[PDB]
Structures are given as structure tokens and as C-alpha cells.
């Protein structure tokens, strides 16, 4: 079954967020987690896996990947995987068996795909149609290496372009009032709200939690649409 599209006033309005949009922006800017062909070095609680990935900027960080249930964590525990996603640091707490903010320790949700058998020869393009106030003025594509790809990765790549080229998120507020990204595969679709919840704080953790289902799409099938409205 296919997720019905956003109802009247179901979408978060950026005008009702009064904190710094910077906190959303840094999730969809260049910094992100991407590791190829790694295996988890520890579990954490029931739903979580810890990975060691290269920092590049000293040597090794720990990423706490959190899924929405134990079946997901059990599945990938002992597999070689690719990890891709939006990571955070503030109020990122975990150990390998309320604590200081640690640059070598970061958190995310989902973003995990089997490595073996998932690699394409070529990078594949997936076209994105953007609607501003219902008009499709802008069309581009995002690229992936993966037969099976997390919606999270595609979401990240899409927004990253919109950040760079349409200023989707700025330091204080967005030029868009509402925004959702919609993924279509055959005649089945689902969408994410691109805007923070109302009020004066943005909880990065709570927002990213939507990726914890590890939702995947076929890169050969999927289409992407973005509906934005202006202020």
C-alpha cells in the first residue's frame, strides 16, 4: 500500500520554526557518513550497531547506527555493508559495552545496505523533478552505485543539491515555507517532510529517527519529486 500525499496543513511550516535553521542545514551539507565495505565492531542496546570508519580530517571514528527494531540490527550485525547517512554529535550518547560531546563519536539512523552483490558497474542517474508552488522549473539527477539504495542516501543527495543551488536551508530560516520529498516506485510512494517541527528548538536526533526503518528502493525503478512552496 502507498502512503497518501500530505493533507491540508499536515506539512511543517518553516515560519513556525523560530530556532536556527543552521541545525537542519548541517545535516544536508557536505559532511555526512559514507563508509564502504565495513562490518560492525559492536552492538549497542538491542537495535544498534557500532562501526569504525575513517575520519580522514585523525584516523578512526565510531558511528552508532540505530535501527527501529532488533531484526534489522541482527540482520546486519555480521555482514559487510555500506553505510550512508546524516550523522549528528550533540546529545549523541553510546558506548561499546549524558556524556561529553566527542568528535570521534557520532550517531545516525539506518543507512545500511549489504555490500556484496549490490555494486553497479556504472554510476546510475535518478532524475529529480522539483515543483515550486506546483510548477516544475527545475529538474536534475542524483547518482548512486547501488542496485538497492536507502531512501536516506537519495534524500541526502537531493537536499544537498537543493542546499547548494536553491538555498533550501540557510543559517537562520529557509526561503521555502513547506517542502516534502516523495519517492515513487511503480505505483507505490512515500514522502518525508523537509521542514523542522514548530517551536524554537530543532531536535536533530528526533528528526533523523525517520530513517531508522532502513527503507530501501531499487535505483533502476525509483523516481523522485520535491514539492516546495514559497513565502
Amino acid at each position, epitope marked *: 500500500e502507498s502512503q497518501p500525499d500530505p493533507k491540508p496543513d499536515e506539512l511543517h511550516k518553516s515560519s513556525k520554526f523560530t530556532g*536556527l535553521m*543552521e*541545525n537542519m542545514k548541517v545535516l544536508y551539507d557536505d559532511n555526512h557518513v559514507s563508509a564502504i565495505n565495513v562490518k560492525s565492531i559492536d552492538q549497542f542496546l538491542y537495535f544498534d550497531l557500532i562501526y569504525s570508519i575513517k575520519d580522514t580530517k585523525g584516523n578512526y571514528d565510531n558511528v552508532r547506527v540505530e535501527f527501529k527494531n532488533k531484526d534489522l540490527a541482527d540482520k546486519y550485525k555480521d555482514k559487510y555493508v555500506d553505510v550512508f547517512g546524516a*550523522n549528528y554529535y550533540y546529545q549523541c550518547y553510546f558506548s561499546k559495552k549524558s556524556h561529553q560531546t566527542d568528535k570521534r563519536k557520532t550517531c545516525m539512523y539506518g543507512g545500511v545496505t549489504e555490500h556484496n552483490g549490490n555494486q553497479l558497474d556504472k554510476y546510475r542517474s535518478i532524475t529529480v523533478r522539483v515543483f515550486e508552488d506546483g510548477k516544475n522549473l527545475l529538474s536534475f539527477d542524483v547518482q548512486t552505485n547501488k542496485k538497492k539504495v536507502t531512501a536516506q542516501e537519495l534524500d541526502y543527495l537531493t537536499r544537498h543539491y537543493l542546499v547548494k543551488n536553491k538555498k533550501l536551508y540557510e543559517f*537562520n530560516n529557509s526561503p521555502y515555507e513547506t517542502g516534502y520529498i516523495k519517492f515513487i516506485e511503480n505505483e507505490n510512494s512515500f514522502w518525508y517532510d523537509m521542514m523542522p517541527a514548530p517551536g524554537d528548538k530543532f531536535d536533530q536526533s528526533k528528526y533523523l529517527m525517520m530513517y531508522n526503518d532502513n527503507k530501501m528502493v531499487d535505483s533502476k525503478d525509483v523516481k523522485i519529486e520535491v514539492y516546495l512552496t514559497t513565502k
Partner: nanobody
Amino acid sequence: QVQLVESGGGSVQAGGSLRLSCAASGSTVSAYYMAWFRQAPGKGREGVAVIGGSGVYADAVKGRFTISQDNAKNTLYLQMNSLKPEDTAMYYCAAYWKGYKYHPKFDDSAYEYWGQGTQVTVSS
């Protein structure tokens, strides 16, 4: 990692202006999210301005104060116009590392480094 030293505090008759400076050593200010706070006698420390976009300002100082950041002098500035008695306070510069992918805005308790501050006194 970053050490902050304020200067420029003094007394000013209402309606005049004043510019505060905060020099930084040990790290480039571009690596930190910089902010100005102030603490009037008989009140908590409160946010004045943060660096980013074209600057984000407390309502109380909107239109009167300007924050800026000179990267090559590794210095922050607070330009204060139309000073009023209410603006009397100890003024503080603060820094939070950008590598945490989080901006505390005016949550003073989150910031990692502070300057000693400077007295601004506005006589009516």
C-alpha cells in the same frame, strides 16, 4: 584550543555608540560558532548576537547592534549604536566548535570557550 580576550568596554552617554572587540588565539575563528552575550546586574546571561547569514540578533538589540568577524585579524566585533541605559551589562564573547554540527544559539551553557568580558555602562 581557542583563547578569547575582550576589550573596548567603557562609559557612554545614552544615544552614542561603542565598539567591542574580541581577539582569538590558538585557532581560527572560522572553525568556531561565535556569539556575543551580556549579563546585566540582577539578571541571567543572555544572547546578543551570533555570527552567520547576515547575523542573528536578540529583539532587544535589533537595528542597533551589528556583529562582525574579521578572519585575518582573527577578531570579533560588536558595534553598538543608540545605546540606552538598559544596555548596561558585562559583555562576553563565546565559541562553540563547528565540528559538532550543532549551533546552541543563545544557550550559554553549551558554549565551550569564553572571554573575561568587558563592562559597558550607559549613563542617561
